[PDB]
């Protein structure tokens, strides 16, 4: 381990009045920092090199040292928040924005990469990158008639950096920035490169992770049908963020949820709800749960697409984190659904797998299940069939499981189970 002497040599070289020595020193720093295993980032920072690197970004008289310095700083910024902060505090952001206009594509694109790492740190550095004016010149690099005229690597790196400018909350990105970027994201969603598509979906998943107003900005672009197309892709790295975006949109208004339904999303859910990735199954069941939180006509679309048997199957057989989402989908369905819809749900066999989860060691899920049972009894009341329902629940051992909850630590569970027993099993 001789990194400390290498760093000492770099400091000496970088302070040479001979530019060839300075360049060689920056080359050596770039090499150290491009090591896969524990690059010596802190050593380089502690040696006081960041101000030197930032100065070199501006050395138009020596494009190679701009390149080497840009790469070195890219990799420091790829580190911890403290490491990224040292780069920011050194004044790197406006220097990198200036380099976006370099006539040297390899330098411009290295600046793109560094800014992606800086913005990726979080909302504060994201907003600094925006504040210093990065968006316009980034978008200009992408404003060519043919996106295939750009090297695949360059377009991927631009897309990724744009996605980080869309990322994070508290605060969300400035609205005017989102308005600037969104039309480019919509264009990119029709590209054929899978990595571009994946990062563009991630960007859109970020923008839809927020209040209805933000969701509304995305929906109004008309992009939802293309997202639904990507939902059916075979590439997991595309489906994953596409599904997150769609799931985020249906946390919005009934009208926003209708856009997703009208776009044909529900037809994809038999595949998603049975997808061998448990994560896809879970996120798809979460998405379904926010659709069954919708209007009765939206529930009816879920019914009409044959999805209720899929929901019963997930509730019965899936991993517990996915079963939790299925419980929510059921409770939402039963909260908002018509009596007929609820009768159909019971006919599909919801009661036994629902009851079986009352043994779960998750208090919140127990409470959600008891809500669902109460909701189903309310439909039974309108029909004059509360006794038939109570007998069904007894006959599958459901009442034994409800009775058992009178010993539960949680008072709401005790009170809820007691209430059902008093109302319907006394």
């Amino acid at each position: 381990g001789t990194v400390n002497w290498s760093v000492d040599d770099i400091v000496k070289g970088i302070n040479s009045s001979n530019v060839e020595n300075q360049l060689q020193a920056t080359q050596a720093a770039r090499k150290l920092l491009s090591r896969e295993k524990q690059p010596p980032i802190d050593n380089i920072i502690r040696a006081g090199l960041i101000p030197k690197f930032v100065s070199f970004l501006g050395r138009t008289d020596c494009s190679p040292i701009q390149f080497e310095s840009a790469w070195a700083l890219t990799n420091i910024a790829s580190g911890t928040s403290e490491q990224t902060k040292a780069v920011v505090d050194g004044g790197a952001i406006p220097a990198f924005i200036s380099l976006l206009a370099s006539p040297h594509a390899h330098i411009s694109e290295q600046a793109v990469w560094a800014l992606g790492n800086i913005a990726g740190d979080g909302s504060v550095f994201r907003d600094l990158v925006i504040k210093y004016g990065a968006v316009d010149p980034l978008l200009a690099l992408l404003a060519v008639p043919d996106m295939s005229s750009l090297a695949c690597g360059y377009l991927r790196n631009l897309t990724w950096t744009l996605s980080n400018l869309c990322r994070n909350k508290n605060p969300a990105p400035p609205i005017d920035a989102v308005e600037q970027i969104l039309p480019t994201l919509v264009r990119l969603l029709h590209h054929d490169d899978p990595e571009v598509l994946a990062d563009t979906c991630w960007a859109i998943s970020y923008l839809t992770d927020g209040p209805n107003e933000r969701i509304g900005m995305v929906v109004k672009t008309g992009v939802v049908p293309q997202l639904v197309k990507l939902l059916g892709a075979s590439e997991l790295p595309i489906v994953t963020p596409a599904l997150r975006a769609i799931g985020n949109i249906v946390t919005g208004t009934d009208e926003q949820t209708q856009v997703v339904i009208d776009a044909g999303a529900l037809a994809v859910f038999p595949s998603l709800l049975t997808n061998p990735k448990t994560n896809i199954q879970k996120e798809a069941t979460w998405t379904m749960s926010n659709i069954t939180a919708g209007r009765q006509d939206q529930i009816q679309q879920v019914v009409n697409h044959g999805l209720v048997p899929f929901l019963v199957s997930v509730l019965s057989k899936a991993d517990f984190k996915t079963q939790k989402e299925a419980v929510w989908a059921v409770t939402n369905y039963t909260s908002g659904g018509t009596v007929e819809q609820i009768v159909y749900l019971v006919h599909c066999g919801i009661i036994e797998p629902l009851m079986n989860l009352l043994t779960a060691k998750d208090t919140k899920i127990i409470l959600v299940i008891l809500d669902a049972i109460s909701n189903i009894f309310q439909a039974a009341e309108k029909l004059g069939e509360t006794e038939k329902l109570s007998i069904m629940i007894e006959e599958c051992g459901g009442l034994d499981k409800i009775e058992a909850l009178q010993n539960h630590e949680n008072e709401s569970v005790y009170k809820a189970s007691l209430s059902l027993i008093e109302k319907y099993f006394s």
Partner: peptide, 9 residues
């Protein structure tokens, strides 16, 4: 990924 270093192959 959120952040990414540039490395040779």
């Amino acid at each position: 990924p959120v952040k990414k270093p540039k490395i040779r192959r």
